[PDB]
Amino acid sequence: MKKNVLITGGFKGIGKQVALEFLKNDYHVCITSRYFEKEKRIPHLFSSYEENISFYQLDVTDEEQVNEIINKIVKKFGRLDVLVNNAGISLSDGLLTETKTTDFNKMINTNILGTYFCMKYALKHMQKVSCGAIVNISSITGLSGFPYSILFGSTKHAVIGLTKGAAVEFADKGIKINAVAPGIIKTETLQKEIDSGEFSEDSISSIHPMQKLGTTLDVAKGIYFLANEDNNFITGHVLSIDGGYLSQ
Amino acid sequence: MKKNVLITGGFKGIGKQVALEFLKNDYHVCITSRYFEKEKRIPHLFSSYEENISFYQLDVTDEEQVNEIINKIVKKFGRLDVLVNNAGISLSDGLLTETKTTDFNKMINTNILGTYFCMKYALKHMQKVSCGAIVNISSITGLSGFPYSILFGSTKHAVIGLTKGAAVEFADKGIKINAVAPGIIKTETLQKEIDSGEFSEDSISSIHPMQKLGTTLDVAKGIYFLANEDNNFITGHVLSIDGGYLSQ
Numbered sequence: 041m042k043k044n045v046l047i048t049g050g051f052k053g054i055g056k057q058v059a060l061e062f063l064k065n066d067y068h069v070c071i072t073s074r075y076f077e078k079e080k081r082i083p084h085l086f087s088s089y090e091e092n093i094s095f096y097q098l099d100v101t102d103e104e105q106v107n108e109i110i111n112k113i114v115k116k117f118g119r120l121d122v123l124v125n126n127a128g129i130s131l132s133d134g135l136l137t138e139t140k141t142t143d144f145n146k147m148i149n150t151n152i153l154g155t156y157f158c159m160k161y162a163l164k165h166m167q168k169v170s171c172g173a174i175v176n177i178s179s180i181t182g183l184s185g186f187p188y189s190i191l192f193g194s195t196k197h198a199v200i201g202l203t204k205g206a207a208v209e210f211a212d213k214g215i216k217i218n219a220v221a222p223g224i225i226k227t228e229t230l231q232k233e234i235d236s237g238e239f240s241e242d243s244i245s246s247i248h249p250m251q252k253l254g255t256t257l258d259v260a261k262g263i264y265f266l267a268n269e270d271n272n273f274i275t276g277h278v279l280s281i282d283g284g285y286l287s288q
Numbered sequence: 289m290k291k292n293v294l295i296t297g298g299f300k301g302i303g304k305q306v307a308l309e310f311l312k313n314d315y316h317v318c319i320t321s322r323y324f325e326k327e328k329r330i331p332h333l334f335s336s337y338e339e340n341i342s343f344y345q346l347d348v349t350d351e352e353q354v355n356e357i358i359n360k361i362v363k364k365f366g367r368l369d370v371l372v373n374n375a376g377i378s379l380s381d382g383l384l385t386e387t388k389t390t391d392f393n394k395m396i397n398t399n400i401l402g403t404y405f406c407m408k409y410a411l412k413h414m415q416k417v418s419c420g421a422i423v424n425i426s427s428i429t430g431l432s433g434f435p436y437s438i439l440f441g442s443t444k445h446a447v448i449g450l451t452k453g454a455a456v457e458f459a460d461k462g463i464k465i466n467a468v469a470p471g472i473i474k475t476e477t478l479q480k481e482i483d484s485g486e487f488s489e490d491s492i493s494s495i496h497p498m499q500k501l502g503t504t505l506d507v508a509k510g511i512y513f514l515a516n517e518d519n520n521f522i523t524g525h526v527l528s529i530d531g532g533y534l535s536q
């Protein structure tokens with residue numbers, strides 16, 4: 041009886057907040073981790089929402105597993121209203137000439153291929169019912185050149201490509217496909233890097249015109265807006281959630 | 289006690305639906321017309337909301353009047369949470385070579401100067417409290433070249449300029465300034481141009497990849513999202529509400 045959303049992730053960072061936002065809006069939420077040991081955290085991470093959450097172990101780089109997991113969800117729930125491609129990694133080296141090819145391939149596999157696989161098998165099901173929403177997560181680096189994050193940015197540019205391409209292809213099938221482009225977001229990972237003193241908050245805050253960092257809630261709200269049933273006419277769009285970064 | 293929004297318009301088309309959207313979200317709404325006679329329509333257009341509506345006569349091309357009206361609103365309500373620059377006109381002729389300078393000037397006056405005047409005086413007040421949101425209405429023609437709508441497109445390009453410029457300028461002051469870029473929207477005006485048979489609905493809706501027209505609610509939802517208290521980190525952005533038009 042509830043709308044159903046699959047998030048690739050959900051246990052930390054943006055993904056966890058995305059899970060919370062959909063739960064607060066009466067969705068059944070499917071969350072994932074590569075690590076089965078995370079399933080037992082659910083009652084404690086999501087106190088009052090336990091009954092509306094389903095766990096799946098999933099590595100998005102494993103195409104067969106992506107197909108298997110999405111099939112399982114569709115069989116069990118009879119619906120897949122929303123896919124959020126949250127899974128993503130940044131292996132931030134130095135200058136381009138010093139970057140590791142192995143790092144690039146890992147980012148390609150997770151950020152591009154993972155998102156492609158999830159889209160590919162979700163759309164197989166969404167096609168059949170002529171409805172659904174996909175929200176991909178890009179970055180400001182997916183729309184601009186960002187020193188020391190060139191390779192990450194390249195993968196996030198590719199994500200925008202998958203978004204716009206699929207949007208135009210599925211537009212007449214009533215499926216909305218959009219992306220968000222976050223600036224620098226204060227996740228747990230970043231918060232502890234600020235807390236350990238190796239990074240000043242004000243130092244990296246200054247990157248955005250609003251002179252503050254983004255929050256996981258900022259991102260979750262944008263994603264929710266693009267995914268909910270009241271989005272009838274927004275598709276192929278990349279929503280900047282960046283305190284004005286891309287407007288300069 | 290309620291958040292307060294000024295809409296340049298409110299009696300027809302997109303502006304009326306914007307009015308309705310903010311009213312449903314517990315705002316006090318200031319709505320305008322150039323025509324004082326429209327005030328008497330309020331209990332009939334907005335049956336259950338009249339206690340939360342204030343009418344002001346306003347021509348946005350009159351800078352003096354814009355300053356007067358915004359001053360009166362701030363004096364009476366002690367707040368101005370949101371400005372929506374809805375007022376706008378399109379005077380379509382033929383090819384560029386055939387266009388009338390008087391038409392261009394009229395569109396410049398209403399679309400560019402009117403939006404500028406309202407921004408100018410709203411920001412004088414918002415600046416003082418370091419909070420507020422402005423949503424401007426651009427168009428797909430503000431982001432692309434559209435035969436037969438070149439001059440209109442030019443004004444809506446200029447609207448984006450004011451949007452991004454002011455966003456960066458006021459970003460550190462806690463004020464969010466964004467725009468929406470609608471495709472072709474089925475307003476009362478269009479609905480009768482379809483009803484008269486001078487245009488087929490399928491004919492003009494085919495320009496959007498979604499193969500349908502936008503609705504006034506589509507636009508209102510987008511504007512509300514960019515304007516509400518939960519937008520903390522989106523500024524300088526142009527949200528396309530265009531059935532995928534700009535993604536091709």
Ligand SMILES: NC(=O)c1ccc[n+]([C@@H]2O[C@H](COP(=O)([O-])OP(=O)(O)OC[C@H]3O[C@@H](n4cnc5c(N)ncnc54)[C@H](OP(=O)(O)O)[C@@H]3O)[C@@H](O)[C@H]2O)c1
Nearest residue numbers: 049050052053054073074099100126127128179222224225
């Ligand atoms: N943080 C930022 O400032 C920022 C800025 C722009 C864009 N983004 C993007 O936003 C998204 C979320 O970022 P975040 O900072 O919230 O990440 P995070 O806190 O590091 O969390 C990463 C999430 O991705 C999952 N994941 C990683 N690799 C996976 C794989 N191969 N298969 C399945 N799941 C995988 C993780 O699950 P397990 O570890 O439990 O397996 C975890 O849920 C990413 O696409 C990221 O690139 C982040």
Ligand SMILES: NC(=O)c1ccc[n+]([C@@H]2O[C@H](COP(=O)([O-])OP(=O)(O)OC[C@H]3O[C@@H](n4cnc5c(N)ncnc54)[C@H](OP(=O)(O)O)[C@@H]3O)[C@@H](O)[C@H]2O)c1
Nearest residue numbers: 297298300301302321322346347348374375376427472473
């Ligand atoms: N309809 C579309 O397909 C479309 C597409 C892209 C963008 N837009 C933009 O969306 C906005 C609304 O369009 P719409 O189609 O909803 O318009 P509409 O139905 O023609 O209504 C026009 C509104 O603008 C007001 N207005 C016009 N000139 C004014 C002036 N000089 N001073 C103060 N108010 C003035 C009118 O108020 P009174 O007549 O009561 O004075 C009315 O509220 C415009 O900026 C338009 O350019 C529309």
